[PDB]
PDB file of C-alpha atoms and ligand atoms in Angstrom:
ATOM      1  CA  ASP A   3       0.000   0.000   0.000  1.00 15.62           C
ATOM      2  CA  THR A   4       0.869   3.715  -0.217  1.00 16.85           C
ATOM      3  CA  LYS A   5       1.581   6.142   2.583  1.00 15.67           C
ATOM      4  CA  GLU A   6      -1.767   7.792   1.929  1.00 13.50           C
ATOM      5  CA  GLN A   7      -3.625   4.487   2.245  1.00 14.17           C
ATOM      6  CA  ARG A   8      -1.795   3.855   5.513  1.00 12.96           C
ATOM      7  CA  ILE A   9      -2.849   7.305   6.811  1.00 11.96           C
ATOM      8  CA  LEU A  10      -6.526   6.643   5.884  1.00 13.33           C
ATOM      9  CA  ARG A  11      -6.454   3.196   7.498  1.00 12.94           C
ATOM     10  CA  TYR A  12      -4.918   4.657  10.638  1.00 11.72           C
ATOM     11  CA  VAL A  13      -7.671   7.290  10.884  1.00 13.59           C
ATOM     12  CA  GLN A  14     -10.374   4.607  10.360  1.00 12.22           C
ATOM     13  CA  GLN A  15      -8.879   2.547  13.211  1.00 14.18           C
ATOM     14  CA  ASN A  16      -7.878   5.332  15.625  1.00 16.36           C
ATOM     15  CA  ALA A  17     -10.466   8.108  15.287  1.00 18.50           C
ATOM     16  CA  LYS A  18     -14.219   8.239  15.919  1.00 17.84           C
ATOM     17  CA  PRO A  19     -16.550   8.273  12.924  1.00 15.70           C
ATOM     18  CA  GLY A  20     -18.229  11.601  12.504  1.00 17.39           C
ATOM     19  CA  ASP A  21     -15.741  13.437  14.777  1.00 18.29           C
ATOM     20  CA  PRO A  22     -13.490  15.710  12.715  1.00 18.76           C
ATOM     21  CA  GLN A  23     -11.269  16.786  15.611  1.00 21.45           C
ATOM     22  CA  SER A  24     -10.438  13.078  16.273  1.00 17.48           C
ATOM     23  CA  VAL A  25      -9.598  12.651  12.591  1.00 20.68           C
ATOM     24  CA  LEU A  26      -7.118  15.602  12.649  1.00 23.46           C
ATOM     25  CA  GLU A  27      -5.520  14.270  15.850  1.00 22.44           C
ATOM     26  CA  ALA A  28      -5.138  10.801  14.322  1.00 24.29           C
ATOM     27  CA  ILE A  29      -3.510  12.182  11.217  1.00 22.63           C
ATOM     28  CA  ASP A  30      -1.154  14.378  13.261  1.00 24.08           C
ATOM     29  CA  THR A  31      -0.199  11.467  15.540  1.00 24.80           C
ATOM     30  CA  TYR A  32       0.479   9.184  12.558  1.00 24.50           C
ATOM     31  CA  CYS A  33       2.643  11.752  10.820  1.00 25.13           C
ATOM     32  CA  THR A  34       4.577  12.640  13.972  1.00 23.76           C
ATOM     33  CA  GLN A  35       5.197   9.077  15.168  1.00 25.83           C
ATOM     34  CA  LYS A  36       5.203   6.936  12.011  1.00 30.33           C
ATOM     35  CA  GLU A  37       5.696   8.688   8.642  1.00 30.63           C
ATOM     36  CA  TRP A  38       5.907  12.409   7.744  1.00 29.51           C
ATOM     37  CA  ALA A  39       3.403  13.655   5.189  1.00 30.94           C
ATOM     38  CA  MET A  40       2.640  17.002   3.531  1.00 29.35           C
ATOM     39  CA  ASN A  41      -0.575  17.776   5.477  1.00 28.27           C
ATOM     40  CA  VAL A  42      -0.755  21.428   6.615  1.00 27.80           C
ATOM     41  CA  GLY A  43      -0.308  20.127  10.205  1.00 30.49           C
ATOM     42  CA  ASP A  44      -1.370  21.422  13.596  1.00 32.21           C
ATOM     43  CA  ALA A  45       0.971  24.464  13.920  1.00 33.23           C
ATOM     44  CA  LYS A  46      -0.187  26.080  10.679  1.00 34.52           C
ATOM     45  CA  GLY A  47      -3.616  24.462  11.158  1.00 33.53           C
ATOM     46  CA  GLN A  48      -4.195  26.567  14.259  1.00 34.19           C
ATOM     47  CA  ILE A  49      -3.567  29.735  12.213  1.00 30.99           C
ATOM     48  CA  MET A  50      -5.972  28.460   9.496  1.00 30.20           C
ATOM     49  CA  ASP A  51      -8.601  27.881  12.202  1.00 30.28           C
ATOM     50  CA  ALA A  52      -8.211  31.449  13.439  1.00 32.05           C
ATOM     51  CA  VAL A  53      -8.623  32.786   9.877  1.00 31.01           C
ATOM     52  CA  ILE A  54     -11.700  30.679   9.160  1.00 33.22           C
ATOM     53  CA  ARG A  55     -13.316  31.775  12.420  1.00 33.66           C
ATOM     54  CA  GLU A  56     -12.640  35.439  11.652  1.00 33.99           C
ATOM     55  CA  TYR A  57     -14.219  35.408   8.163  1.00 35.66           C
ATOM     56  CA  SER A  58     -16.848  32.637   8.485  1.00 36.52           C
ATOM     57  CA  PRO A  59     -16.719  32.079   4.680  1.00 32.73           C
ATOM     58  CA  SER A  60     -19.795  30.675   2.968  1.00 30.83           C
ATOM     59  CA  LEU A  61     -17.893  29.360  -0.066  1.00 31.72           C
ATOM     60  CA  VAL A  62     -14.251  28.219   0.097  1.00 30.82           C
ATOM     61  CA  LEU A  63     -12.072  26.911  -2.802  1.00 28.89           C
ATOM     62  CA  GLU A  64      -9.069  24.710  -1.985  1.00 27.50           C
ATOM     63  CA  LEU A  65      -6.330  24.014  -4.523  1.00 27.74           C
ATOM     64  CA  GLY A  66      -4.667  20.718  -3.712  1.00 26.32           C
ATOM     65  CA  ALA A  67      -6.465  18.272  -1.372  1.00 23.80           C
ATOM     66  CA  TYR A  68      -3.896  15.527  -0.771  1.00 23.63           C
ATOM     67  CA  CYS A  69      -5.464  13.317   1.956  1.00 25.13           C
ATOM     68  CA  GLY A  70      -8.153  15.783   2.995  1.00 26.16           C
ATOM     69  CA  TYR A  71      -6.510  17.122   6.187  1.00 25.80           C
ATOM     70  CA  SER A  72      -6.990  20.809   5.334  1.00 25.47           C
ATOM     71  CA  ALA A  73     -10.453  20.084   3.907  1.00 25.49           C
ATOM     72  CA  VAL A  74     -11.451  18.475   7.245  1.00 23.40           C
ATOM     73  CA  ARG A  75      -9.800  21.340   9.156  1.00 20.97           C
ATOM     74  CA  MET A  76     -11.738  24.043   7.280  1.00 20.35           C
ATOM     75  CA  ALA A  77     -15.012  22.200   6.769  1.00 21.82           C
ATOM     76  CA  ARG A  78     -15.433  21.378  10.470  1.00 24.54           C
ATOM     77  CA  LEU A  79     -15.559  25.137  11.220  1.00 23.75           C
ATOM     78  CA  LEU A  80     -17.952  26.146   8.403  1.00 20.11           C
ATOM     79  CA  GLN A  81     -21.456  27.331   9.330  1.00 18.99           C
ATOM     80  CA  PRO A  82     -24.487  25.262   8.406  1.00 20.11           C
ATOM     81  CA  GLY A  83     -25.041  25.510   4.665  1.00 19.13           C
ATOM     82  CA  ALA A  84     -21.496  26.821   3.894  1.00 19.10           C
ATOM     83  CA  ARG A  85     -19.489  24.805   1.426  1.00 19.09           C
ATOM     84  CA  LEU A  86     -15.981  23.876   0.398  1.00 21.14           C
ATOM     85  CA  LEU A  87     -14.879  22.898  -3.122  1.00 19.31           C
ATOM     86  CA  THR A  88     -11.454  21.197  -3.283  1.00 17.12           C
ATOM     87  CA  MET A  89      -9.556  20.446  -6.495  1.00 17.72           C
ATOM     88  CA  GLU A  90      -7.144  17.510  -6.675  1.00 19.43           C
ATOM     89  CA  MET A  91      -5.660  16.203  -9.917  1.00 19.99           C
ATOM     90  CA  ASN A  92      -4.305  12.907  -8.465  1.00 21.31           C
ATOM     91  CA  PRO A  93      -7.143  10.396  -8.614  1.00 21.41           C
ATOM     92  CA  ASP A  94      -5.669   8.253  -5.825  1.00 25.57           C
ATOM     93  CA  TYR A  95      -5.397  11.332  -3.543  1.00 27.42           C
ATOM     94  CA  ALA A  96      -8.932  12.429  -4.551  1.00 29.62           C
ATOM     95  CA  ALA A  97     -10.189   8.957  -3.504  1.00 29.02           C
ATOM     96  CA  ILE A  98      -8.367   9.171  -0.148  1.00 27.17           C
ATOM     97  CA  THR A  99      -9.777  12.645   0.426  1.00 22.01           C
ATOM     98  CA  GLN A 100     -13.360  11.547  -0.286  1.00 20.76           C
ATOM     99  CA  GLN A 101     -13.046   8.645   2.133  1.00 19.33           C
ATOM    100  CA  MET A 102     -11.459  10.852   4.795  1.00 20.58           C
ATOM    101  CA  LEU A 103     -14.313  13.343   4.552  1.00 21.36           C
ATOM    102  CA  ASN A 104     -16.864  10.501   4.640  1.00 25.86           C
ATOM    103  CA  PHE A 105     -15.297   9.103   7.794  1.00 27.73           C
ATOM    104  CA  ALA A 106     -15.299  12.600   9.417  1.00 25.25           C
ATOM    105  CA  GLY A 107     -18.953  13.030   8.474  1.00 25.02           C
ATOM    106  CA  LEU A 108     -18.235  16.174   6.451  1.00 24.41           C
ATOM    107  CA  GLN A 109     -19.246  14.793   2.992  1.00 24.01           C
ATOM    108  CA  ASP A 110     -22.274  17.055   2.735  1.00 26.13           C
ATOM    109  CA  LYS A 111     -20.160  20.221   3.112  1.00 27.77           C
ATOM    110  CA  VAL A 112     -17.380  19.361   0.655  1.00 26.24           C
ATOM    111  CA  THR A 113     -17.193  18.588  -3.051  1.00 25.91           C
ATOM    112  CA  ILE A 114     -13.922  16.982  -4.143  1.00 26.15           C
ATOM    113  CA  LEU A 115     -13.337  17.704  -7.800  1.00 25.24           C
ATOM    114  CA  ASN A 116     -10.841  15.316  -9.477  1.00 26.27           C
ATOM    115  CA  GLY A 117      -8.979  17.449 -12.077  1.00 26.47           C
ATOM    116  CA  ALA A 118      -6.437  20.264 -12.588  1.00 31.36           C
ATOM    117  CA  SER A 119      -7.246  23.721 -11.258  1.00 31.60           C
ATOM    118  CA  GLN A 120      -6.460  25.408 -14.569  1.00 32.43           C
ATOM    119  CA  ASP A 121      -9.111  23.236 -16.282  1.00 31.12           C
ATOM    120  CA  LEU A 122     -11.727  23.403 -13.468  1.00 27.55           C
ATOM    121  CA  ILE A 123     -11.479  27.055 -12.371  1.00 26.76           C
ATOM    122  CA  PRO A 124     -12.966  28.284 -15.710  1.00 26.58           C
ATOM    123  CA  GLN A 125     -15.970  25.931 -15.213  1.00 26.13           C
ATOM    124  CA  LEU A 126     -16.861  27.118 -11.710  1.00 27.08           C
ATOM    125  CA  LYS A 127     -19.452  29.718 -12.730  1.00 25.99           C
ATOM    126  CA  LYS A 128     -21.344  27.807 -15.379  1.00 24.98           C
ATOM    127  CA  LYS A 129     -20.942  24.175 -14.238  1.00 24.44           C
ATOM    128  CA  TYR A 130     -20.790  24.557 -10.439  1.00 25.48           C
ATOM    129  CA  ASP A 131     -23.069  27.625 -10.080  1.00 29.78           C
ATOM    130  CA  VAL A 132     -20.410  29.754  -8.350  1.00 33.31           C
ATOM    131  CA  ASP A 133     -20.751  33.566  -8.332  1.00 32.29           C
ATOM    132  CA  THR A 134     -17.662  34.652  -6.346  1.00 30.75           C
ATOM    133  CA  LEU A 135     -15.461  32.964  -3.775  1.00 31.89           C
ATOM    134  CA  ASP A 136     -15.216  34.084  -0.156  1.00 33.02           C
ATOM    135  CA  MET A 137     -11.894  32.344   0.538  1.00 36.10           C
ATOM    136  CA  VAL A 138      -9.238  30.364  -1.337  1.00 38.85           C
ATOM    137  CA  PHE A 139      -6.703  27.995   0.279  1.00 37.09           C
ATOM    138  CA  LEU A 140      -3.645  27.414  -1.948  1.00 35.64           C
ATOM    139  CA  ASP A 141      -1.702  24.241  -1.246  1.00 38.08           C
ATOM    140  CA  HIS A 142      -0.918  22.715  -4.669  1.00 37.86           C
ATOM    141  CA  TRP A 143       2.218  22.994  -6.816  1.00 38.74           C
ATOM    142  CA  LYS A 144       4.017  26.088  -5.537  1.00 39.07           C
ATOM    143  CA  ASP A 145       4.731  27.454  -9.048  1.00 37.48           C
ATOM    144  CA  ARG A 146       0.990  27.445  -9.751  1.00 39.27           C
ATOM    145  CA  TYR A 147      -0.109  29.791  -6.894  1.00 39.16           C
ATOM    146  CA  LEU A 148       0.540  32.916  -8.974  1.00 41.42           C
ATOM    147  CA  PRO A 149      -0.865  31.635 -12.294  1.00 41.19           C
ATOM    148  CA  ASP A 150      -4.004  30.397 -10.605  1.00 43.42           C
ATOM    149  CA  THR A 151      -4.492  33.653  -8.650  1.00 41.20           C
ATOM    150  CA  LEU A 152      -4.340  35.536 -11.953  1.00 36.21           C
ATOM    151  CA  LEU A 153      -6.738  33.021 -13.546  1.00 34.02           C
ATOM    152  CA  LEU A 154      -9.249  33.393 -10.633  1.00 33.82           C
ATOM    153  CA  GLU A 155      -9.300  37.135 -11.223  1.00 34.49           C
ATOM    154  CA  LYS A 156      -9.663  36.744 -15.016  1.00 36.01           C
ATOM    155  CA  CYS A 157     -12.633  34.441 -14.476  1.00 37.34           C
ATOM    156  CA  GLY A 158     -14.406  36.970 -12.242  1.00 39.99           C
ATOM    157  CA  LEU A 159     -14.288  34.728  -9.177  1.00 38.13           C
ATOM    158  CA  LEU A 160     -12.687  37.257  -6.801  1.00 37.35           C
ATOM    159  CA  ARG A 161     -14.711  39.984  -5.057  1.00 37.25           C
ATOM    160  CA  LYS A 162     -13.692  42.823  -2.761  1.00 36.80           C
ATOM    161  CA  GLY A 163     -12.721  41.022   0.439  1.00 37.28           C
ATOM    162  CA  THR A 164     -11.964  37.554  -1.001  1.00 39.64           C
ATOM    163  CA  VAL A 165      -9.358  35.965   1.343  1.00 38.38           C
ATOM    164  CA  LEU A 166      -6.447  34.073  -0.280  1.00 36.47           C
ATOM    165  CA  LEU A 167      -4.587  31.937   2.299  1.00 39.74           C
ATOM    166  CA  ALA A 168      -1.358  30.343   0.953  1.00 43.85           C
ATOM    167  CA  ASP A 169       0.540  27.447   2.578  1.00 41.99           C
ATOM    168  CA  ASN A 170       4.303  26.982   2.266  1.00 41.81           C
ATOM    169  CA  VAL A 171       5.272  30.489   1.381  1.00 43.11           C
ATOM    170  CA  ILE A 172       8.720  29.854   3.052  1.00 41.59           C
ATOM    171  CA  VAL A 173       9.220  26.089   2.475  1.00 39.40           C
ATOM    172  CA  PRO A 174       9.181  24.935  -0.282  1.00 38.84           C
ATOM    173  CA  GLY A 175       8.442  28.606  -0.997  1.00 40.74           C
ATOM    174  CA  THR A 176       6.396  30.518  -3.521  1.00 39.15           C
ATOM    175  CA  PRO A 177       8.633  33.465  -4.290  1.00 39.94           C
ATOM    176  CA  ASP A 178       6.842  34.832  -7.382  1.00 41.75           C
ATOM    177  CA  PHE A 179       3.411  34.684  -5.700  1.00 42.52           C
ATOM    178  CA  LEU A 180       4.729  36.427  -2.537  1.00 43.54           C
ATOM    179  CA  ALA A 181       6.508  39.158  -4.486  1.00 49.94           C
ATOM    180  CA  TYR A 182       3.430  39.715  -6.594  1.00 52.68           C
ATOM    181  CA  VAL A 183       0.769  39.961  -3.917  1.00 51.83           C
ATOM    182  CA  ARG A 184       2.971  42.006  -1.575  1.00 53.63           C
ATOM    183  CA  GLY A 185       3.685  44.462  -4.396  1.00 52.58           C
ATOM    184  CA  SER A 186       0.162  44.770  -5.728  1.00 53.55           C
ATOM    185  CA  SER A 187      -2.267  47.510  -4.696  1.00 51.15           C
ATOM    186  CA  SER A 188      -5.050  44.958  -5.403  1.00 50.50           C
ATOM    187  CA  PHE A 189      -4.014  42.916  -2.336  1.00 51.19           C
ATOM    188  CA  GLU A 190      -3.699  43.586   1.403  1.00 49.64           C
ATOM    189  CA  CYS A 191      -1.160  41.053   2.758  1.00 47.32           C
ATOM    190  CA  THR A 192      -0.389  39.586   6.140  1.00 46.05           C
ATOM    191  CA  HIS A 193       2.315  37.049   6.959  1.00 45.05           C
ATOM    192  CA  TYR A 194       1.835  34.399   9.692  1.00 43.90           C
ATOM    193  CA  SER A 195       5.194  32.827  10.568  1.00 40.34           C
ATOM    194  CA  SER A 196       4.958  29.233  11.722  1.00 38.72           C
ATOM    195  CA  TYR A 197       6.549  25.844  11.219  1.00 38.71           C
ATOM    196  CA  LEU A 198       6.589  23.187   8.551  1.00 36.91           C
ATOM    197  CA  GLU A 199       4.190  20.411   9.404  1.00 39.55           C
ATOM    198  CA  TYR A 200       5.660  17.989  11.956  1.00 36.39           C
ATOM    199  CA  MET A 201       9.079  19.634  11.780  1.00 38.54           C
ATOM    200  CA  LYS A 202      11.291  22.158  13.531  1.00 34.46           C
ATOM    201  CA  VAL A 203      11.695  24.127  10.329  1.00 31.85           C
ATOM    202  CA  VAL A 204      10.292  27.655   9.823  1.00 32.39           C
ATOM    203  CA  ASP A 205       7.467  27.989   7.333  1.00 33.07           C
ATOM    204  CA  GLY A 206       4.548  30.455   7.047  1.00 30.76           C
ATOM    205  CA  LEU A 207       1.133  31.255   5.698  1.00 33.94           C
ATOM    206  CA  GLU A 208       0.359  34.360   3.653  1.00 32.39           C
ATOM    207  CA  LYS A 209      -3.062  35.968   3.739  1.00 32.06           C
ATOM    208  CA  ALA A 210      -3.745  38.194   0.761  1.00 32.80           C
ATOM    209  CA  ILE A 211      -7.141  39.927   0.708  1.00 34.14           C
ATOM    210  CA  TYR A 212      -8.336  41.007  -2.756  1.00 36.35           C
ATOM    211  CA  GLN A 213      -9.221  44.714  -2.922  1.00 35.83           C
ATOM    212  CA  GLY A 214     -10.747  44.828  -6.427  1.00 35.58           C
ATOM    213  CA  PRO A 215      -9.141  46.483  -9.485  1.00 34.61           C
TER     214      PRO A 215
HETATM  215  C1  7JN B 301      -1.771  22.942 -10.854  1.00 37.18           C
HETATM  216  N1  7JN B 301      -3.136  22.515 -10.496  1.00 37.18           N
HETATM  217  C2  7JN B 301      -3.396  21.507  -9.665  1.00 37.18           C
HETATM  218  N2  7JN B 301      -4.693  21.163  -9.550  1.00 37.18           N
HETATM  219  C3  7JN B 301      -5.054  20.142  -8.751  1.00 37.18           C
HETATM  220  N3  7JN B 301      -4.180  19.432  -8.046  1.00 37.18           N
HETATM  221  C4  7JN B 301      -2.889  19.800  -8.127  1.00 37.18           C
HETATM  222  C5  7JN B 301      -2.479  20.847  -8.901  1.00 37.18           C
HETATM  223  N4  7JN B 301      -1.135  20.948  -8.737  1.00 37.18           N
HETATM  224  C6  7JN B 301      -0.786  19.988  -7.910  1.00 37.18           C
HETATM  225  N5  7JN B 301      -1.825  19.304  -7.494  1.00 37.18           N
HETATM  226  C7  7JN B 301      -1.800  18.145  -6.591  1.00 37.18           C
HETATM  227  O1  7JN B 301      -0.951  18.435  -5.505  1.00 37.18           O
HETATM  228  C8  7JN B 301       0.286  17.700  -5.569  1.00 37.18           C
HETATM  229  C9  7JN B 301       1.437  18.608  -5.225  1.00 37.18           C
HETATM  230  C10 7JN B 301       2.603  18.059  -4.407  1.00 37.18           C
HETATM  231  C11 7JN B 301       1.529  18.913  -3.727  1.00 37.18           C
HETATM  232  C12 7JN B 301       1.847  20.358  -3.372  1.00 37.18           C
HETATM  233  N6  7JN B 301       2.421  20.495  -2.050  1.00 37.18           N
HETATM  234  C13 7JN B 301       3.738  20.345  -1.795  1.00 37.18           C
HETATM  235  O2  7JN B 301       4.532  20.048  -2.697  1.00 37.18           O
HETATM  236  C14 7JN B 301       4.171  20.496  -0.370  1.00 37.18           C
HETATM  237  C15 7JN B 301       5.497  20.161  -0.035  1.00 37.18           C
HETATM  238  C16 7JN B 301       5.977  20.328   1.246  1.00 37.18           C
HETATM  239  C17 7JN B 301       7.419  19.912   1.526  1.00 37.18           C
HETATM  240  C18 7JN B 301       8.007  18.829   0.881  1.00 37.18           C
HETATM  241  C19 7JN B 301       9.301  18.479   1.200  1.00 37.18           C
HETATM  242  C20 7JN B 301      10.003  19.238   2.091  1.00 37.18           C
HETATM  243  F1  7JN B 301      11.267  18.852   2.384  1.00 37.18           F
HETATM  244  C21 7JN B 301       9.446  20.293   2.763  1.00 37.18           C
HETATM  245  C22 7JN B 301       8.134  20.658   2.450  1.00 37.18           C
HETATM  246  C23 7JN B 301       5.096  20.766   2.251  1.00 37.18           C
HETATM  247  C24 7JN B 301       3.787  21.093   1.945  1.00 37.18           C
HETATM  248  O3  7JN B 301       2.973  21.571   2.961  1.00 37.18           O
HETATM  249  C25 7JN B 301       3.352  20.988   0.622  1.00 37.18           C
HETATM  250  O4  7JN B 301       2.052  21.376   0.460  1.00 37.18           O
HETATM  251  C26 7JN B 301       0.341  17.102  -6.951  1.00 37.18           C
HETATM  252  C27 7JN B 301      -1.136  16.954  -7.284  1.00 37.18           C
HETATM  253  O5  7JN B 301      -1.589  15.788  -6.587  1.00 37.18           O
HETATM  254 CL1   CL B 302      -3.494  19.155   3.938  1.00 37.96          CL
HETATM  255 CL1   CL B 303       2.626  20.447  13.113  1.00 36.81          CL
HETATM  256 MG1   MG B 304       1.304  22.508   2.106  1.00 36.13          MG
END
């Protein structure tokens, strides 16, 4: 089996069905004690929680699902009726993510779309009935944060106040995205210094709030 299958099995056998907090704890224990994996983790996760609670977004887009850790983290704090869409091009990861959300009991709040962001983002309005996004969590290939930000704006998916929250702006790093948002009058940026998941290595989140054109 794969590392991601082992993580899902561990959750199924060590967390409580329908209890998202137990699912996060199981994943964090597994990845601390057994095998590292690229989940956002508890250190950065706590900052994500604080952001979600501040904005109470009704519609969130996530780029890159992996095993569903961040999707569980965000979805568990959404208000009744609020929704998360998460895009994941790897079909095996998309399958893990669906099963993780099912186990957590969050399936009704989240739609896991199996495809590439650059193909799916242009379909959001007409196929998925999206007007604008309240929040976007970027956690996919680091060289695609900037292109996809620019594509979201082109597609009319950003509104005044849309919150972009970007993982891994230090490690592995997203230098073009950071330079761009920090230099642009269309974004108000805040940096939240933290640590790489499960490691004593500095990382950080960037919040970039869209201000319109
Ligand atoms: C471009 N559009 C895309 N659309 C949908 N899914 C996409 C998509 N680009 C891609 N996807 C999916 O996401 C998959 C890429 C690999 C993830 C993206 N994350 C990372 O690379 C990552 C890495 C580290 C890391 C690794 C090693 C170190 F020594 C230190 C840090 C930590 C993280 O927190 C990370 O998030 C591939 C694919 O499954
Ligand atoms: Cl994650
Ligand atoms: Cl952590
Ligand atoms: Mg990440």
